[PDB]
Design a protein around this ligand. Structure first.
Ligand SMILES: [K+]
Lengths: 518, 512, 503, 514
């Protein structure tokens, strides 16, 4: 059959593997959301329109670069591209906007004739790392300047300094009033303003800088839906982000980025107070050995799956597509395996920010994700999500597991749920139904935010409330169905599970019913 | 409480190791009890005791007694049952089942006579021989016996305690050596294992008895000696179109019935493992194999299965059962039987209410000891994909009930079918079935864990109100009967429009 | 098709049940041991020979009844029946003898009398009942129940409790002479042992009994007291603790740790706790003994009706089969062999039910869970054992042949519940008899003096295991066999597993 | 803790994931074999010694390029580096040599010149042999004449490993008129793919036959057969290998749609499988390759046969010293899939970091092997494997079971052909399988089996066979202690047979290392 149904029926996992078929075609409804980083290559309204058509669900604003007005315009261009489809409300796709904070970054300085200048740090060389503003524009083959004054106090003799995504390596030999004398361990070529990593050194930069508070308040005052909080090391780092957003930003989802050894080891306490997680493999693969990142990835996704909270896998997923129109075999493998790992979202960075094929990269992620979602061994995944989820007396969670068990029984095409904040939809999403979870909401922000929950397809209902409440409920269900037929999710003859509550307002989801599509 | 550390276990072995004798069963008893009506259990006042003890189905054994006798049984059972209708929140429906005589073979005619082991014995069918059988001649009321048991075959008399080996097909009978001597009363039952009996699948007496059951409104027929699908059709023909609502439980009693089981189960409403006859027809050490096989396949099919015969046999004379009898009851419940049965323990024994009480107490403990983990998983994985909204709602409701350890699943049903579809996934939570059909209320006693409630008030002017007062009726009866407490969660299962077949809704509610 | 192999290969338990087949014939070798009680019905040498051929493996001497010389005559008759087959070394079946201790038994005195319900009776005739437990007047408070005769008789103590307990018959019935008395729910004082039990135990040591069924064991101390009273020559005698009351069940783990094995004594246990809960105690105890690798015995009223009837009831056949399915190593006949009219028939019945039931075990899941639950081990005997059972399941080997001195090699194979018969070849006469407690072990007593070179003495015992197996119908010319041996003489060094074709 | 055994013991797969720990070091030796492709960057003896030291187990000779004498030179340098470590018998690491055939390839023509094909320019594909040397920005020549009649209008023609694409505008007399879809710099003699086309090229060309006979006479251990479509193709390779090539292992490369759908019949007649992801990702949608990889690894694991994952595992390390996140993740996930081997192509044939690429695969494989959920894997392999009466497989599964029970460090097995080692490896023990053999070829070939560590025994036989048996066991122990697989106080399982010669394995022992 299609959607790898024979591999879904399998006795065992081994026999499930043996029955996967390249000829079996998947469902149109791709359920892992795609996050695209906005930059020069993806900033135009018309480019953004093609990225929404290819499947982008979350636009990422990287506040490591750009002014407040630069980002204000990209927010504007995105909202303009998005609302361009609002005329046909049965196809309208909400697109969320995420603010990715700069955080405690450390960067080198501008070199000799700044523009495009290159300097090769020869292996075996002596190089000085300086924090004197005189040497800030002074970069050469024996001098590097950094924007971290206290670097001279936290990197001991014998400590290793990484430059340019870890391809350059220095080892401190002496400390002096002129800075730190280092012997180059791993040479290479050095541009301007490259990131620096000090794994193991006790960096004293605050988790939330003075500009970060400014950036967060910007996002509140421009209406961002999601904050990606960089270099989160502890539960108190999430609290600072929460305070910074203040009462006006209480509705904003905080995804903590796990980027170093501390964040991995303090993982459980970070997840407890976050809304979700980003496995930030770039920084992570410099901070810990590269052959261990996948362990960190598979652990955090497992624990996020268990807890029911969104997990994002990020960085170098389709790296070569910066330059080439087709990805490497390792790159398609990587996207597929993050979907099979259980990730809710996958990310593109340079591939959409500055490469020559941003729309093709999104297309590629969409096509790989549809095949991989079909190849999940739902039989063991659902059974294990059931056993690991504790007993509950909340009617929303009880209705939710009932509806997912019901959806597997009839191979339902979808589970239509009414939700004010998204919570009813997220509780469905955490049992990983194969049926699409079609969330009908009046909340524009909730429509956007549910893109973090795998398998939730948001629909923004906008018609005004009807006189009788039960008629308003029925109308939104009918909106779910006809949006779903128009988008290819549903066909006449399908069964659908419909989830609703007994009274208006959030928190009262308690009804599940089985409907045939006529 | 309720052996849930054992229900929590990751493996069956760990599950056994964690069973606790000091864990009391909170749940109500879910396996129905059938009691056979006889001289020990016919007075209105005795029946009342037996109802309170827990009897859910009364079995009329049509192997004995005149039609007027069984009409008296029916009238007495109904009087004792309606004795409680004045309090509708606690009224227990009780089904009435008619057990057919069948293709019985008996010997000829307090009085006794011994047949010596190794004796030479004659079997003949001659009509004047019928009157005086001696220690060397046995007469049977089956003429074709002389054609059906060839040389070397065995003839069993009196519950298989006496056997005979045929040596030659004589001219005026069958010359047999006694293999197992014993002392033989008058007109006792004969079994012919490994014999092709041409006796009709439904005799003319059975047809009169099934018409009687229709006229008197029995809910259930236990059809004796069912060998093939066509035997069920003869029963369904004798019941006629007027008896279409009566459930047919086929009694598997011999080797053929075991071999043709799949074809029998498919045309029946359910099965009775009749271990008495079956343990004569096949070696006694094989009955448990047949019992577990048949309970298994009925479980897979979602059809009722009854375990019957000698479960508490010693309680005919003694006030306490043996250790083998208590484990037999428990193990039939563990196997997955929907019903367990008493025959002589209630028909003629000295302790009929005690035996009912013993089964009820054993059923409660054993139902708690079921390894629900592996069972619900295997049942949902074995059950095929369904597009029927009633079945889809059922499994969703059962999964929801396990998630919040709901005390009850309250369902509205007209034919019982929605209750039965919940029953087949074996919820731990009670299935409380609210129906206006008095007959359906009696018949769903066949399904394990269904507790019927007969709603008596006329339909409210607004249907949605009629549904809600039925649901509240389920809640109020539950609280009175100890199934529900204030603050519990219940799952409520209904349909989107009146009439049967439209169940499709599942809600979670908190009591009060 | 045979041995219920379709049901054994099913992927789920439910499918396993659905595939069970009344027409699938089982293997000749029954693996659950049969324990028969000796009594008037089972005491003649001729009869005992017939019971051995019907499959008795352990003969139980009930020291609750009879005198010391009575029991020594039983032992002599047992051994004369057993040793009548000793001219046949390849078919010789060891038969163990087990001493079931009297223990803290309370019995009435000395014909028959009826006790009407509501009557006033005194515990010191129809109104008087004598008891052989002096401290009963001190441990039964007022309102406390006294059960007599398998718990059929109920009594409740009146507020008078001085020179004899004045009582009220709570459940009337008929009372014989010297019938048991049970005092549940009231905390008792009677010693763990007695002078009779000590001397009974010592008599057991003098006459070479192999096993002790220790009555009414509620603590580790009881088992130590039993092993103490058995004396320095009493080592080597296996001690089965009989769990008989509420205290012994809930302190089970500390008892099993100290004991060689367990007997679920449902007779008394069904009086001491509600009868509805015995099956819980039975399944809990068999599971825990299975998890521990220690033999468990299921006992009492298994074929009760066969005391007077040639054919069991449907519940009795069911109960035997379900004890075997639960995992019991042994099953017992008490009155059915000791005093009834059909002692050989009752042994034949248990033998026939057990063979059917053993094939109907869902081995696939049983083996998996026994593996997962058994801990890691650096003992080469334990490592070789689970290797060999796993190898046995892959080739459907007819048997695992094992050389053992103490039986411990055989017991460690047996704890993984292999389907293949474990054929244990030993020189220790007593060990050959004691391994009947372990399901699946078929002991062979090797009688030859040792060969010069130890490696030829090993091959010879291995072939002795083959030839015996072929003669008895365990093995045949196409069967594959696993041979488990050791790298040096003396017990404790098992470490080799070989796969061989039985020529 | 170590070896991820908290995650190994978890009762569910989800819980096993949750317990994976980056601080848990792998102590088991590396079990997935590393195959390195020889080329300019890896043909010096000096670099080959560093690659053997970093982890290389098999050297791949790519017969798509280079003359026979070129390949004889590679073989000779490989052997010189490998025998540079003989003379220390307890640490000598065998290295197998594998011959990767050319197969039915399709190449463009001769143009060191380069031509740019620009996006949306119109290009002609011609077979006309006059144009064999006249290629430019709008005409391409291909060595496959029937390409005119098998590519319909609108079909696709891929050049340059799928980089450049051509949609057929029109078909005419001069050839196929096409337009660039994606342009790129087109070199001479580049590879061409025809997805969804009928290519009737023979499985075995004459030069392939010539190449196979070259490998027999130079004693290669393995043949990687390109573009296997059917069982018939494997028989042709075995036939061309001749009577002297009896003992050569044939790994079938699955490269296109047909080999995937005829996989079972190909698997039954092959010694093993390579997922050839480069060609395969051009012939089928790139989004479907992971499916075929996982299907094929599963079936080979089920069948107990070696499976190789290949192509672009560490591709960025051709020019960069450190791989990308996707690349490390890819290697880890191939080991977790169950691959017996992982492969390097341009990373070691031509890139600038050949030794480091090997090192990186070794370090990733070690972390991944410990992250295998052994509990479910061994259980499923047990019940999935059929009942057997061969005593070598009965012993193997008994020995693998015993090994898990005592957490043995090693299973020492004596083997002549390698078969008894392979029958242990198919049950995926965590304990290393230390295989002692006198057969130097078998020593090289069992690198195909995950978790097998070959030791080449060189002493002459002893007069009494029992003594010869046991000093071979002792050779494995001492080799194991020297290498770190084994330590005083460990338990090992020893697998041996009852009679000399192959096929008679049937004994398993548990012994303490002293
Ligand atoms: K950032």
């Amino acid at each position: 059959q299609q959607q790898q149904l024979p591999a879904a029926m399998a006795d065992t996992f081994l026999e499930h593997l043996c029955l996967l078929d390249i000829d079996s075609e998947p469902v149109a409804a791709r359920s892992t959301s795609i996050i695209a980083t906005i930059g020069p290559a993806s900033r135009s309204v018309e480019r953004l329109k093609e990225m929404i058509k290819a499947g982008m669900n979350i636009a990422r604003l990287n506040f490591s670069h750009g002014s407040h007005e630069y980002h204000a315009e990209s927010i504007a261009n995105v909202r303009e591209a998005v609302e361009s489809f609002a005329g046909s409300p049965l196809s309208y796709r909400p697109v969320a906007i995420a603010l990715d904070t700069k955080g405690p970054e450390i960067r080198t300085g501008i070199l000799q004739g700044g523009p495009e200048s290159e300097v090769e740090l020869v292996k075996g060389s002596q190089v000085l790392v300086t924090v004197d503003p005189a040497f800030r524009t002074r970069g050469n083959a024996n001098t590097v300047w950094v924007d971290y004054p206290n670097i001279v106090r936290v990197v001991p003799v014998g400590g290793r300094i990484y430059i340019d995504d870890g391809l350059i390596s220095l080892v401190v030999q002496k400390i002096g009033p002129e800075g730190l004398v280092t012997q180059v361990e791993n040479g290479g070529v050095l541009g301007s303003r490259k990131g620096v990593n000090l794994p193991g050194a006790q960096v004293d930069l605050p988790g939330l800088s003075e500009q970060d508070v400014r950036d967060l308040r910007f996002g509140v005052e421009h209406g961002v839906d999601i904050v990606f909080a960089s270099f989160v090391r502890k539960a108190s780092d999430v609290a600072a982000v929460r305070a910074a957003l203040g009462p006006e930003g209480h509705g904003i989802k905080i995804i903590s980025k796990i980027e170093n050894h501390e964040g991995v080891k303090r993982f459980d306490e970070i997840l407890e107070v976050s809304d979700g997680i980003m496995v930030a493999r770039g920084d992570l693969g410099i901070e810990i050995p590269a052959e261990k990142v996948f362990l960190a990835q598979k652990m955090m996704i497992g624990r996020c799956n268990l807890a029911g909270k969104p997990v994002v896998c990020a960085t170098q997923m389709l790296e070569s597509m910066i330059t080439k129109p087709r990805p490497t075999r390792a790159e398609t493998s990587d996207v597929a395996n993050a979907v099979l790992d259980g990730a809710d979202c996958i990310m593109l960075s340079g591939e959409t920010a500055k490469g020559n094929f941003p729309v093709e990269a999104v297309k590629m992620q969409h096509a790989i994700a549809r095949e991989a979602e079909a190849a999940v061994y739902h039989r063991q995944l659902f059974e294990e999500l059931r056993r690991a989820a504790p007993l509950s007396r909340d009617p929303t969670e009880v209705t939710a597991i009932g509806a997912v068990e019901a959806a597997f029984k009839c191979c339902a095409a979808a589970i239509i749920v009414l939700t004010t904040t998204g919570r009813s939809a997220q509780l469905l999403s955490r049992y990983r139904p194969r049926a699409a979870v079609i969330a009908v909401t009046r909340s524009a922000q909730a429509a956007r935010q549910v893109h973090l929950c795998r398998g939730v397809f948001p629909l923004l209902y906008r018609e005004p409330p009807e006189a009788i409440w039960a008629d308003d409920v029925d109308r939104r269900v009918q909106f779910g169905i006809e949006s779903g037929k128009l988008r290819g999710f549903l066909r006449v003859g399908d069964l659908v599970i419909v989830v609703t509550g007994w009274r208006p307002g959030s928190g009262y989801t308690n009804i599940m019913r089985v409907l045939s599509i006529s």
